[PDB]
Symmetry: D2
Subunit: 130 residues, 4 copies
């Protein structure tokens, strides 16, 4: 019997976004760019704010949405962390890059998040998977 990975609560994000700018409209799919204008990061590991970032999404006529994003967290104690998201919406996979010694452990983390309330898509809870 394969052994499943362990899940540990990592952080939450309460994001603010600009309007979705559709650049590729067709009967088959809509592709958009959306700015991440800010956000609150909370949790037992790091808290802080989202400085900025961009999301690219493709919304299929079939209801499938694939999104890729980068955004920059700045922690309360001044560390910069790049967040790399890849999603099969509403499921979001996450990688991290930082040279902060306090937060360096995130360079080895795969995380995963989803909005706990699918009526509030800009509030996500993320889990460390290992």
């Amino acid at each position: 019997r394969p052994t499943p990975p362990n899940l540990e609560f990592l952080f939450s994000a309460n994001l603010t976004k600009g309007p979705a700018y559709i650049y590729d409209q067709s009967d088959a799919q809509i592709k958009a760019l959306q700015t991440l204008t800010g956000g609150i990061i909370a949790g037992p590991n790091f808290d802080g704010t989202v400085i900025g970032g961009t999301a690219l999404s493709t919304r299929g006529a079939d209801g499938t949405i694939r999104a890729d994003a980068h955004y920059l967290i700045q922690t309360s104690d001044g560390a910069n962390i790049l967040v790399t998201e890849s999603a099969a919406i509403p499921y979001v996979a996450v990688l991290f890059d930082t040279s902060s010694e306090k937060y360096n452990w995130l360079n080895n983390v795969t995380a995963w998040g989803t909005p706990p309330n699918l009526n509030e898509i800009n509030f996500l809870e993320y889990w460390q998977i290992e």
Copy 2:
């Protein structure tokens, strides 16, 4: 208390790889390209073989390894599925693309895998996270 996602066993991969070709060697990190020459896919959902694909890795002097890969599964019943991997080795995040009607549900899946035996890095077990 945040609610964790559910984990369901998805597939295993027993991959074959060519040699790692280092193209960027420095004291700080090694970057390599590695061909995925084949592999066995097994599990309760799909079985088949790996047709081909490429992995790009960066191995830090700090022991962190980040890898990105694409490879193509062909199922026993003839479906082509693109696998998009992004890893903080040995933890691997996975997305899928197919137009197969039988396997279309994978377009909405985030999966996650790791070698159950870290002495055998080319055998991974993957889980659907949702």
Copy 3:
């Protein structure tokens, strides 16, 4: 004797950027995220403004700078065009995505740009290469 491609002036961009947020500082290289906060697009083909976008750069101790960016142009006549940049700074390669019928021809274009004045890195002139 190989035949070189033809070069036609395509557009200029006068970009505004936020501060460079360094997330990965080491003796070997600096990696940063920078927001594209706006900009003027001009030329004989399209004019308009930059709505938004993000640049990721790595600046080597060796002086090499590699950058990738996405930003969204909105033309004077309301068309949305995604610009995908990949650079060996100060040389910038460009692709485009739009479903605008007026600007659809850009989906088939490879462009290339550089600041005419390397003291003014945020003003670039771009050329259609074919």
Copy 4:
């Protein structure tokens, strides 16, 4: 009057490819993975062979083809160079990564290529643009 960049002949590639594996077939577009199984590299700067690599393409019902590829050149004198291609077919933009001291200058190069004969799509001539 904007000043155009200079074009210098860089290399040619005579590539071999495996079959195109379509993973996403629809009336709107076809997405495929294709293995680069080998190739001859020639020119005044470097000659050698293609070790391997993968191309991902999307072929629109509208005739537009967008492709992204990575492949590894090994020069006659043993240097490994990663080639990163992004194309609006048949126009191909190119970046390079190597730590070879002899070929390090390619890390600062944007190149561009196209098949001189569009009946022979696997033979391309590439130009340094700067």
